């Protein structure tokens with residue numbers, strides 16, 4: 905995951 909928002913959303 906990326907983004908610090910978990911899976912998907914912001915990469």
Ligand SMILES: *C(=O)/C=C/CCCCCCCCCC(C)C
Pocket residue numbers: 905906911
């Ligand atoms: C968050 O989504 C983390 C997920 C773990 C998987 C990451 C992808 C690893 C493999 C990438 C392979 C790239 C190819 C060879 C272009």
Ligand SMILES: CC(C)=CCC/C(C)=C/COP(=O)(O)O
Pocket residue numbers: 905906907910911912913914915
């Ligand atoms: C490492 C970089 C440059 C960004 C994306 C790499 C990746 C593993 C994406 C998956 O993240 P999500 O689950 O947040 O979509």
Ligand SMILES: [Ca+2]
Pocket residue numbers: 905906910911912
């Ligand atoms: Ca992911």
Ligand SMILES: [Ca+2]
Pocket residue numbers: 905906907908909910911912913914915
């Ligand atoms: Ca994300």
